[PDB]
C-alpha cells in the first residue's frame, strides 16, 4: 500500500506536472492561434496544430 501510495503520489504529481505543463506550452502556442511551431512533438496530449 506504500508502493501503491507512492505511485498515486507519482500519479497526481505527474498529473499536475504534466497537465499543467500540457495546459502550458499551448497557452503560449494556442493563443496566437496561427502559431507556426512544429514542435508540438513534446507533449502529444494537447494536440491539433493549424497545419503550421
Amino acid at each position: 500500500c506504500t508502493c501503491v501510495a507512492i505511485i498515486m503520489v507519482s500519479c497526481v504529481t505527474s498529473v499536475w506536472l504534466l497537465c499543467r505543463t500540457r495546459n502550458l506550452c499551448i497557452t503560449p502556442y494556442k493563443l496566437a492561434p496561427n502559431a507556426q511551431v512544429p514542435i508540438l512533438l513534446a507533449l502529444l496530449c494537447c494536440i491539433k496544430p493549424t497545419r503550421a
Partner: protein
Amino acid sequence: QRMCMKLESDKTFPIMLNGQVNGYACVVGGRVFKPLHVEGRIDNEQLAAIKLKKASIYDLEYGDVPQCMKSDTLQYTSDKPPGFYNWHHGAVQYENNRFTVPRGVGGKGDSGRPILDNKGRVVAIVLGGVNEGSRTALSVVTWNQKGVTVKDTPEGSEPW
C-alpha cells in the same frame, strides 16, 4: 480620429465587478482574453455565462467564443513595428520590445484595452506599466516575432 471611431465599434467588453469596471474583456483572434485578477460579470450572455480556468502565468482567462461572434473578431498580426497603436486613453509607441504612453493613461479600470493599429490590428493587451519619468509604461501580454504569446512587463507593474 481613428483612435475612437474604429475603437468604439470594436467589441471589447467591460468587466463590472459589482458595477465596477475594473478591466475589459476583449475578443481577440477567435478566443477571448479576460485579465483574470479583474473579476465580475460581463455585458454579453455569450460571455457572462461561461466558465473559465486560469492562464495563471499570464493571469488571463481564455476561449469561450461562441460561433456567432466568430467570423468577426479582432484579427491581427502577432508582430509590431514601432508604430502608433491607439485606444481610448491615447496612443503608444516604442522601438525595441515594449509599450510606453504619455503620462496619465490610467491603469485602474483600464487593463484589458486591446492594442490596435490604425489599420485595426491587435498587437497586445494592457496589463499595467509604471510611470517612467515623463512617460507611463505598459506591461502587456503580446506576441513574439515568432508568434509565441508572451508578456512584457516592467518592474513594479500596476493594478488593473
